[PDB]
Amino acid sequence: VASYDYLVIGGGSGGLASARRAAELGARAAVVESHKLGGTCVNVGCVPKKVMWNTAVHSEFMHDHADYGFPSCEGKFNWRVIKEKRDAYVSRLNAIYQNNLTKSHIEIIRGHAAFTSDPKPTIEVSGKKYTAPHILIATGGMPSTPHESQIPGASLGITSDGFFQLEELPGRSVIVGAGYIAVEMAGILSALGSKTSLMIRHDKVLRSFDSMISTNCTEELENAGVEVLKFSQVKEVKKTLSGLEVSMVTAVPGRLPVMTMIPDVDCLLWAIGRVPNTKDLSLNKLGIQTDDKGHIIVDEFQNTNVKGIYAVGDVCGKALLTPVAIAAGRKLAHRLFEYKEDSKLDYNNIPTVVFSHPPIGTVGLTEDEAIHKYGIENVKTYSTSFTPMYHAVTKRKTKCVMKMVCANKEEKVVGIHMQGLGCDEMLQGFAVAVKMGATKADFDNTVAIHPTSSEELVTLR
Amino acid sequence: VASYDYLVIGGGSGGLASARRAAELGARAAVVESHKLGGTCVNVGCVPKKVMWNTAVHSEFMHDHADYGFPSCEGKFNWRVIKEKRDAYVSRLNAIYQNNLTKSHIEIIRGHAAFTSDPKPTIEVSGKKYTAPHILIATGGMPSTPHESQIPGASLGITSDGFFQLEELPGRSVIVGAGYIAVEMAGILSALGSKTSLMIRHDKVLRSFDSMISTNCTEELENAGVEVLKFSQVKEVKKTLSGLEVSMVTAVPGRLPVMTMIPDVDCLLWAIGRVPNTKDLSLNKLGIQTDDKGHIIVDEFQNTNVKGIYAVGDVCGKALLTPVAIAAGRKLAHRLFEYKEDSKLDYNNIPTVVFSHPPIGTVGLTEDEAIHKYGIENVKTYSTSFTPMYHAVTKRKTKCVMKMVCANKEEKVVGIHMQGLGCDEMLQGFAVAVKMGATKADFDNTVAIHPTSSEELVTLR
Numbered sequence A, B: 001v002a003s004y005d006y007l008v009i010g011g012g013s014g015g016l017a018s019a020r021r022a023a024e025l026g027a028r029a030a031v032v033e034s035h036k037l038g039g040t041c042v043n044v045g046c047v048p049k050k051v052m053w054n055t056a057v058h059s060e061f062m063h064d065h066a067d068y069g070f071p072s073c074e075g076k077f078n079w080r081v082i083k084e085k086r087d088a089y090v091s092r093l094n095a096i097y098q099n100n101l102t103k104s105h106i107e108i109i110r111g112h113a114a115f116t117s118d119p120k121p122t123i124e125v126s127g128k129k130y131t132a133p134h135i136l137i138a139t140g141g142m143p144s145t146p147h148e149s150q151i152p153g154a155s156l157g158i159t160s161d162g163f164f165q166l167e168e169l170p171g172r173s174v175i176v177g178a179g180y181i182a183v184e185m186a187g188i189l190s191a192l193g194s195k196t197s198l199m200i201r202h203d204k205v206l207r208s209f210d211s212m213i214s215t216n217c218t219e220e221l222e223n224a225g226v227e228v229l230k231f232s233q234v235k236e237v238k239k240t241l242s243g244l245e246v247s248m249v250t251a252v253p254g255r256l257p258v259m260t261m262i263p264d265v266d267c268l269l270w271a272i273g274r275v276p277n278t279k280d281l282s283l284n285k286l287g288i289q290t291d292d293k294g295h296i297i298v299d300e301f302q303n304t305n306v307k308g309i310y311a312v313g314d315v316c317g318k319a320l321l322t323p324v325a326i327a328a329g330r331k332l333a334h335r336l337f338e339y340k341e342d343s344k345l346d347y348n349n350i351p352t353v354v355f356s357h358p359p360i361g362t363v364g365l366t367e368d369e370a371i372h373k374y375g376i377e378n379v380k381t382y383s384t385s386f387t388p389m390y391h392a393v394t395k396r397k398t399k400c401v402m403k404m405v406c407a408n409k410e411e412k413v414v415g416i417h418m419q420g421l422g423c424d425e426m427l428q429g430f431a432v433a434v435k436m437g438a439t440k441a442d443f444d445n446t447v448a449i450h451p452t453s454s455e456e457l458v459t460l461r
């Protein structure tokens, strides 16, 4: 049984972040990884996603070309070529991580950890046993897919994981789901020239976001030529000669339910949520607490109910983002090995960008959440809608919408929400301000930068 | 002699801003304008500039096309087409302004104001006389050009003004000057396919900027294929059969001065500074104070030395930016007609974007200014340099460089400086933070947005 100061299960965002910091602070650390280093962000997530989003915006700028005085240009996307480059960049990052771990003398253990029934907390991998005083569970999540028992043929669909093994551009795609992953996939696929539908259970996408964003994003998807199938659900999927055929019910409000069939579908993509990676960890051997969906229960310090065992990141099911996983992993390593006992992540005012077309930036409270929290009379919103000057000379149009949610007499800025060109690089600075408790006065007394989109957030009236 | 509450000379950025606010506050206002409404920003400045910069970045993305899996595409820019669209958009804005002034019952007086020798402060235009209790001078500036007595042939060159009358793409351009206007013009012209040189008196451009930016921008101009002619000065310009021919001295440090000739030059562009528009105002009739270059002298409230006469914007020669002109004009209208006696513009931490390739964002103090102000031991800088993920799959590379200048034990952020993709929409939020007195801790405890360029400013070590 080999011994460390710090055993980390999972070499993704949270695990690597925490292993590294602990090594810096002088711990003897090991990372267990069953697949590739870098986890979801590197391999099947934020990094390959961004490369494909960059590609997709190349597609949109191809369209605007002739408008900008350039040769009317032309057509055909080669998926193979960018797929190869994207793979090679991911592999590059895998090696960068293995090499940085090794330079820091963090041991890599290759394989699938489970906990044993030993009384000391102890894992085993290809069954050698391993233990530390401090074990971090950082095993992330995976996509959920329907069971065949609910929807016959469900396993003919792929997930976002399979999206990154796609070797050619699907001629015709149906994406199921209404969250940020579904929206992003639909936008990439349609931009590059797949005939895309997005199938959602209600009338709008991103329904947990501020209703301005929810509404505007549903519109901009339609405008970009994504077919949004509202109030619709897959009932089953069949293999045919010419691809998949998808049965849906559409059940619009105050009309009769109608069953239709989508033929000729090359890619059916389930984006209906993620489940945590805990089923195979033998958690019940130690009585580690989960909820009904198998998230690990932690306190504000990332403690499980079992002393000396911790969890960060997707596996806990709160704020499912790479930088959250990282910051929580780093804070925890400061607590354990620098004995900074008040080291913890604040989960408030965490900013998000959704990489739609155009991208969404959001931080803080929706106008709804603010009203519930402050009461209707203590909430003031300011908002705006304009066409970026980029589009002054193009036929194609997108909007920029911005919204500031303000609280109380001093008008503390408790929420910013936007979708527009450039809003992906816009948000970080404003989220700094919002974490400081900036009030609208603070915004109004910053001099504007002209001409930009961003200057509108400091000139709202 | 016709009478108003508020007479404004100049219908550009500052003038229109101040006229409008005063009307809102219930004054009877008139604007005198000799050319077109909207002034320099609308007509020969920030708006046409931005449209051409947008065009230029279309050129750069054409290059990256084949890298992103798209048909190798191809060539030929049609200047005529975007020039027409750009003109029509400017004219559109002219009409928008005339119409908003009229809706607000602000009188437009068309023609050239000068002051008279009347004892009451009084102007005349096509000589009708006009007066108010309150006169705003907002006449802006114009480009300077060399005299024929210093450089024979100087009047064969154009200025930035003439740049916007260009009907075709100059085959071969020589830009003279080293400030932001020169850099921007060189970058637009080269991107669109002019063989461009930029002629500068020393070794780097933007020498008033933080030395990281100065250095990196000089490099990125070279990399984008702008020929930077260092330590060089025009001695004269001649018309030939095949265009202009430009004589320069190059006088590099510790080498012999060498005279060379640049033949075949279609466009010589002077960008060596701006002079204020005061020569024709008959200021001396009222004893209004200027400096040796004819800027109008004001206090922190925009008062001249003559009671009831004010000046905002470029004509005062401080912070030559549209949003500064606007904010000062608006603050002043609040002082005069809302009797808010402490209404004034803070000229500190005014942010600037320079629209090079890639763009520059800067706010606050250079590492130099900070050292002079805080002493060397109380200044800490953090900086970084990376290649944006955009470029992970392209042959072409640009850098992103970022720099945070920090002061004192708490490490107040007193300076941010960057050049990179997206840095034009990045800056506004961070400048809000900087105006609040944000410290590096405030930055470090904002959660990052991944994957973006902007997240690097909150993860510096």
Ligand SMILES: Cc1cc2nc3c(=O)[nH]c(=O)nc-3n(C[C@H](O)[C@H](O)[C@H](O)COP(=O)(O)OP(=O)(O)OC[C@H]3O[C@@H](n4cnc5c(N)ncnc54)[C@H](O)[C@@H]3O)c2cc1C
Pocket: A009, A010, A011, A012, A013, A014, A015, A032, A033, A034, A035, A036, A037, A038, A039, A040, A041, A044, A045, A046, A049, A111, A112, A113, A114, A138, A139, A140, A141, A160, A181, A277, A280, A281, A312, A313, A314, A315, A320, A321, A322, A323, A325, B450, B451
């Ligand atoms: C399609 C998609 C796009 C996304 N886009 C973004 C984005 O743009 N921005 C953003 O911030 N977030 C994004 N995310 C979320 C981000 O990927 C995750 O929030 C982040 O990776 C969470 O890190 P983690 O440490 O929890 O888990 P992970 O990164 O999943 O890592 C867990 C690791 O544990 C390994 N592992 C699992 N169980 C075991 C075991 N028993 N033994 C050994 N090894 C094991 C796994 O193989 C894996 O490498 C995206 C997610 C997806 C799926």
Ligand SMILES: Cc1cc2nc3c(=O)[nH]c(=O)nc-3n(C[C@H](O)[C@H](O)[C@H](O)COP(=O)(O)OP(=O)(O)OC[C@H]3O[C@@H](n4cnc5c(N)ncnc54)[C@H](O)[C@@H]3O)c2cc1C
Pocket: A450, A451, B009, B010, B011, B012, B013, B014, B015, B032, B033, B034, B035, B036, B037, B038, B039, B040, B041, B044, B045, B046, B049, B111, B112, B113, B114, B138, B139, B140, B141, B160, B181, B277, B280, B281, B312, B313, B314, B315, B320, B321, B322, B323, B325
């Ligand atoms: C090439 C270029 C690009 C620029 N790019 C940017 C940028 O991207 N961002 C930015 O913020 N700043 C930019 N600027 C600066 C910005 O254009 C000016 O700072 C801004 O217009 C200042 O406004 P103003 O009110 O002082 O003067 P102006 O806008 O010049 O307006 C003065 C007005 O007075 C009129 N006038 C003059 N004298 C008289 C008279 N005697 N009687 C009647 N009418 C008269 C003029 O015709 C004019 O319309 C740029 C400037 C240039 C030249």
Ligand SMILES: *S/C=C/C[S@](=O)CC=C
Pocket: A012, A013, A014, A015, A016, A017, A020, A038, A039, A040, A041, A042, A322, A326
């Ligand atoms: S997917 C990104 C991972 C980078 S590490 O988790 C941060 C510390 C090295």
Ligand SMILES: *S/C=C/C[S@](=O)CC=C
Pocket: B012, B013, B014, B015, B016, B017, B020, B038, B039, B040, B041, B042, B322, B326
């Ligand atoms: S060039 C931009 C001018 C807009 S106005 O000066 C601001 C108030 C209407």
Ligand SMILES: [Cl-]
Pocket: A035, A036, A037, A094, A095, A098
């Ligand atoms: Cl690996």
Ligand SMILES: [Cl-]
Pocket: B035, B036, B037, B094, B095, B098
């Ligand atoms: Cl006009």
